[PDB]
From a paper:
Aichi virus 1 (AiV1) is a member of the Kobuvirus genus belonging to the Picornaviridae family of small non-enveloped viruses. The capsid of AiV1 is composed of 60 copies of each of the three capsid proteins VP0, VP1 and VP3 organized with icosahedral symmetry.
Here, we report the structure determination of an AiV1 virion based on diffraction data affected by perfect hemihedral twinning. The AiV1 crystal diffracted to a resolution of 2.1 Å. This provided evidence that the crystal may be hemihedrally twinned, with the two domains composed of I23 unit cells rotated 90° relative to each other. Superimposition of the icosahedral symmetry with the cubic 23 symmetry resulted in the crystallographic asymmetric unit containing five icosa­hedral asymmetric units (1/12 of a virus particle). Based on the orientation of the icosahedral particle and the crystal-packing considerations, the virus particle had to be positioned with its centre at the origin of the unit cell. The procedure permitted the structure to be determined from a molecular-replacement model that had 16% sequence identity and a 1.6 Å r.m.s.d. for Cα atoms in comparison to the crystallized structure. However, some regions, including the surface loops of VP1 located close to the icosahedral fivefold axes and the N-terminal arms of the capsid proteins located on the inside of the capsid, were difficult to interpret.
Numbering used by the authors:
A (entry chain B), B (entry chain B): 13 to 55, 64 to 75, 112 to 370
C (entry chain C), D (entry chain C), E (entry chain C): 1 to 220
F (entry chain C): 1 to 56
G (entry chain A): 1 to 83, 88 to 233
H (entry chain A): 103 to 203
The structure:
Amino acid sequence: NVTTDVGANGWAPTVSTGLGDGPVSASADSLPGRSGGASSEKTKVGSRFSKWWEPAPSSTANPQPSLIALNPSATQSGNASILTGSTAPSLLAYPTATPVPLPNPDEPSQPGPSGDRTWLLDTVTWSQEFTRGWNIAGSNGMQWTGLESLIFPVSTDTNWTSTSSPTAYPLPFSFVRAYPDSSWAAMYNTHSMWNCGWRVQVTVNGSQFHAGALILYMVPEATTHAIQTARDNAGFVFPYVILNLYESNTATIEVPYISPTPNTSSGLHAPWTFYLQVLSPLNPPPSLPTSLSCSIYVTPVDSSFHGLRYLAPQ
Amino acid sequence: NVTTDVGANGWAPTVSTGLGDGPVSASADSLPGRSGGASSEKTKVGSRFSKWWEPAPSSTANPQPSLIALNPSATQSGNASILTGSTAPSLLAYPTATPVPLPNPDEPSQPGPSGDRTWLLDTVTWSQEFTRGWNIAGSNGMQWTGLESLIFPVSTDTNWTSTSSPTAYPLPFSFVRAYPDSSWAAMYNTHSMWNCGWRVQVTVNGSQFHAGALILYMVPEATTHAIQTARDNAGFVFPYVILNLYESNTATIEVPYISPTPNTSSGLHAPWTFYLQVLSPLNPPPSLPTSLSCSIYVTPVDSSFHGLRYLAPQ
Amino acid sequence: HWKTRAVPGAGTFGSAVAGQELPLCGVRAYYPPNAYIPAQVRDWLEFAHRPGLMATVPWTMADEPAERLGIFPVSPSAIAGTGAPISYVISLFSQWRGELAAHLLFTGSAQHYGRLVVCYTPAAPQPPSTMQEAMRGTYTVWDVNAASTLEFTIPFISNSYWKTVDVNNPDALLSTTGYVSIWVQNPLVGPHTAPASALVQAFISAGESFNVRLMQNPAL
Amino acid sequence: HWKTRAVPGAGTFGSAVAGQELPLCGVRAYYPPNAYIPAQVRDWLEFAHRPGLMATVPWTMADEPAERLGIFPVSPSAIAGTGAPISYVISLFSQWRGELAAHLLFTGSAQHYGRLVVCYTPAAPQPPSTMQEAMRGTYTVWDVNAASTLEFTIPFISNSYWKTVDVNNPDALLSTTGYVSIWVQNPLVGPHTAPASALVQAFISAGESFNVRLMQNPAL
Amino acid sequence: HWKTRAVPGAGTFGSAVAGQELPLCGVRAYYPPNAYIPAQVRDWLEFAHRPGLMATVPWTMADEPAERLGIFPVSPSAIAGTGAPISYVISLFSQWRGELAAHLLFTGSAQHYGRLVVCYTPAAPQPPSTMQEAMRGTYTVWDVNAASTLEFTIPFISNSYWKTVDVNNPDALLSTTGYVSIWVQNPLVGPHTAPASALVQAFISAGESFNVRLMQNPAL
Amino acid sequence: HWKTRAVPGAGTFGSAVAGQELPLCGVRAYYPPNAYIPAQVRDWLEFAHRPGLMAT
Amino acid sequence: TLTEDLDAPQDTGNIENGAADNSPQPRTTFDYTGNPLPPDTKLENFFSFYRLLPMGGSGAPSLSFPADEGTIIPLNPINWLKGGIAAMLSCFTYIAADLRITLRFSNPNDNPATMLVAFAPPGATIPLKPTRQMLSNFYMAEVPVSAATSTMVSFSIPYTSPLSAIPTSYFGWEDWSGTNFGQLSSGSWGNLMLIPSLSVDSAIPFDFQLSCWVAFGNFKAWVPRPPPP
Amino acid sequence: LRITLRFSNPNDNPATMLVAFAPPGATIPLKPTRQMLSNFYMAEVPVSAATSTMVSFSIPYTSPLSAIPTSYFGWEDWSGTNFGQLSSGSWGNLMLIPSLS
């Protein structure tokens, strides 16, 4: 239904000829190897040429009640569990993809239950003074608006200690720094490439008299423009779940693995970044605290590490 | 799988037309005649138009032992035989090709066992003072780096006697000069064209305490750039066998006939040239000679001579 | 040889014309496996279907009945500049049609009660001045204490099949469909020591029948 | 007559474009028989599969354990300038993949004994400083007195499917796969009056899964 | 309209290119009957097959044995300038192959007797100096008193499949096949009062396997 | 490549000539339903068949 | 595959025999697999693309010739190596293909010209004084050259060499007298004779600049040679 | 990728532009010359005098990555000198060289 040539999704004999030429297209590379790339879904050599020398979440039919009513749910990973007694969002942002053949032949090293588990990433305060689009982060977080000059390697203290409050939680950078002795971080500092998904949950307990909303954002490849648009009205294009005090005391969000390569380089690339920003400023009841405490959790989903060699931290 | 026209490997009717033109290609010439050209494989006339007046070598599954162990082999040609008691390389560099119809009708003259035999080409010394890429040659050899001004005919003494040491063994130039009274050289000086393959073997006996390696190179059409690249790291693209003192006391290499023409002109063209250069400088044991003697052998394989006429030497 | 004659416009470049490119790569290229990457998008409407905040409307206990809290015309002067994902898709094209999905999220307290009437009035020379005048069009009286978000459908009660996206002429007959306004039906109430105010987050996204055609340089 | 219109780029020459040549020879040519000529090559990888020396690493009896004898990054700064047949093929193209075959030929004495550990460590910000740190990657402890050559496979443990051949940026994530180094595991030993040193000839060639694409002007 | 793009070389004329002519005669022409005309030639080799004198070699009774009467190299310096019909055909093309037919016509007396040895020696750096040296190649001792003409075949004992017709380089390996010479084997004898001399007319024509290809401007 | 030769009148515009336009709209357009509109005329003679005063 | 092995296969071979063991050596927890062959490495495909031909002499990118007599450019591989594509061809001893050549004639003066390019077969007698009449006997093409700019034109020549395969290197002499060493004039696709033509008369004699591009059809190569340093 | 280039020529004399395609990951020459650019997949485009000349090209997905990122949170090299960039993550580089007779 277009006058232009969108491509035949491959290479055809009639495209390139000595009488006429059309736009050239690339075909799919058929490769053998170990299945990997996609998280939660991953599970004699001879040359083919002769040699010269050789011879529904949101529905009006199912309305979810406010904080008052009993509506319990739970999230489990490894030996960790987080419970709630009221309406709580818990969504995988994107559906898991299909596995792909890996270019490397080495068998992966898996941390298992010791690594893939729900970890207490950070504990932070949420005051009423924070306005719309205010990114909240604590001691384990990092000030990342995209304008900060990151001194390599990211483990340098100046990157995490700033004159103003931190804003982001770069994965796995923030997770590895929070728990450097974990089995996931042990393999992370020993392997050149990794692969896993990420699940972030935040618990904010407020009474039936408290009001306010927080958005749990998972930002892919966080850069200056991307972080600022996530603060704006269009930010909801990115994976999100809102923690509204009217009905919820917690909100969960999970995202599968993403990267230009099937395996991400350790200590040099942050595919996902968590952002806990304010949609509706905290509106606490009179004669009560003007701030509520928040507990941020992080969960690596289906981890695999390739390329074992010496210890090189981030 | 290319946008360009690589050619249909022949002449097609749709290529050249009054409406469109494509790249013209040449077809294979179907010719009758005597089978020749390829060594070791070679074994009423009327016009077709009316007249107006008329009505594995290297494998880990089969590791070859060092010089210490018994691993004998032999090379035979004519009434000549060369034995060894240790691991020795013996490879035909390229597989023999298929015969082609000859343009000439005359029956070939063959020297037989008297010509096709293993001849003692030269005896030369291999000292430890020779470094990487040092071409070794003796009295019967020729200084050929490609820069020497060869005075025609090649039989001129100035071509073989130089101020510096000789380096190459041009075939058949060096073979005919070493044995001018041989049946192969008798036909060589009587025939305008010849055809045969070449086998070169070198024997270097060193004790179990000696170390060093020599490469037996067979260089096609030896010219300035070709000879210098054979001395370098890329030289192994040319036919080669290494005579490593760790395991070997001899190394054999054979190459089939090559030439732009099915038969090579006598005294004017050297298809193959032998080069015995150093890979690892001789590393002799203390209190022992600083040089080892080497014996170079040459073997013409399946010879045939065409075009008999008067005696014209090289 | 073929006898040919050139028609007017020889050598002219066209963005919608096919068959102009010449091969600048001779070999057949093979792209690496990319099936492991999730979230594959193929249509611009997928962005429009995603949520997008358009207005943060405040609501206090002091607000009396028939008090206007917000009003916006369903014209390219507003719907193309809300900041929502849908407004960017609308600005890229010249024409639009179909229903619009409005989601009013009540981010107040669980102890708060009250009603906010959301009114949609079709095209008129003058917008509704009072609450009862706005309630003469398609409206929904929304009780805030139930499920968190209100699903308000803005029907495509239009004169023509398509509406123009021209910011220079938003009040045209072939451009605007009307006005959507929020009014205080029943005052915000709640126990003492509860918040005196409650924010309502207004989201806007594309409906199941929403469409856009005829591309242009972003309206804004 | 045919009504035609010229698209942009008329009269432009293309190296990858077909059907530009006009016949400069009218008769049908017949080439002479060439089946008698051996060693017919049809692919550039055939050159890469041929052996090629990259380093002449010395090894003496005085060399103690954990002593480094050689180290090179598997990046276009090294693998494209070794002097081997494979380095020329790599330099001709922009991308490469697959395993690399390393052959360490022991040209010492039959009376010599010892061990040299060959370590391959994947990509890292800093190369291995000590022997035990290098032995944390894919390695093979090689006893020199057995068969003459060591067959060490350099695995393609890569982040991406293809690696770039850019000499200007060799340490890039999409360029280097790591480092390959030689260390003295067990000191070179042998009887008295035997050579005090033994040279090891390091060869490098293409593996059975090695490939190269996207041609360019020789990197060096 | 057809979207077309011009390749390099527009408006260029080619002698081997077809489809360039435009009709300069509208009606269908009918040629008069020409079947009554004999001697229709269709190939250039037909001219080469016709006889052609190349040398008038004299022979007297005073000529002793081993005396040279004539010699010519089978190269483009001679075979393309004999004056024979075949030499013109050879000069028109760049390459030639096949056997050459030489016809030595004895125009002497019926009372004359003697022998002339015709020798063909393949390619060599130096031509034959004596009769016995020339007789080491393909020769035929011809007794003049039998049939009038001697049928001497010059065999194509060549290094390559084709020989070049380059007058600038006749002694090249890919140009000459050798030398053809005439020597007095047995002295010319006859009764008293018979002619003291006898002329031998040397003719040269193409053999049944003779061919020529790749046209050029006449070599001479 | 196709061997072509241009005939006289190259680049000339013709009102009765077809195949001169180049696409200035890439997408396939869909026109709104117009079957509700009456009085569809398809010929110029339909106007001629309608009455017309010529002289009083 | 096994995670550990007490009796694993050893990894030591012998490269002295003449061939490298390019097979991936088996390792625990490792799964070596092959890869599909790209069309980029095939010599029939690689040499089908055009590359700038080095002009005879020093291997220059361009050659300047007067408009009075013109120039003769040989299509000989050995003559091309005296300077790139020549370096790529030097990796092969013998080659045989159908040549594709594109010429570029840079015209400096303000008036248009016409170039006469005739194909002289390999082995043919090359005229001492190139004239319009003699070059017309060969397979020629008349190319119109524009003013103050360069004009490009492509040609196709099949394998017309008398040899079975054209050598890039030659150890020997061309003639039996032994005057020219390391050359074979016939071992080529022939010679291209150029003659400029002008309708107007210029007071100052100017020179044309020539640039050449070469591609190969049905490329066949024999007896590999080491790459250039 | 499909790309159309326009070369505006200011002077009164015609020219010729040499546009060569450098693959993503290939070494880009410091001094672009006619000989080196001819080794890449090139095209010689005639440029008219005192006006602009347009020419279209087609390049398939030749990037070594599975998908080209428009945003990148990390470093290109292991030394960490270039942040937020991936040179190979592209359709390559187009090298231009003007030519005058």
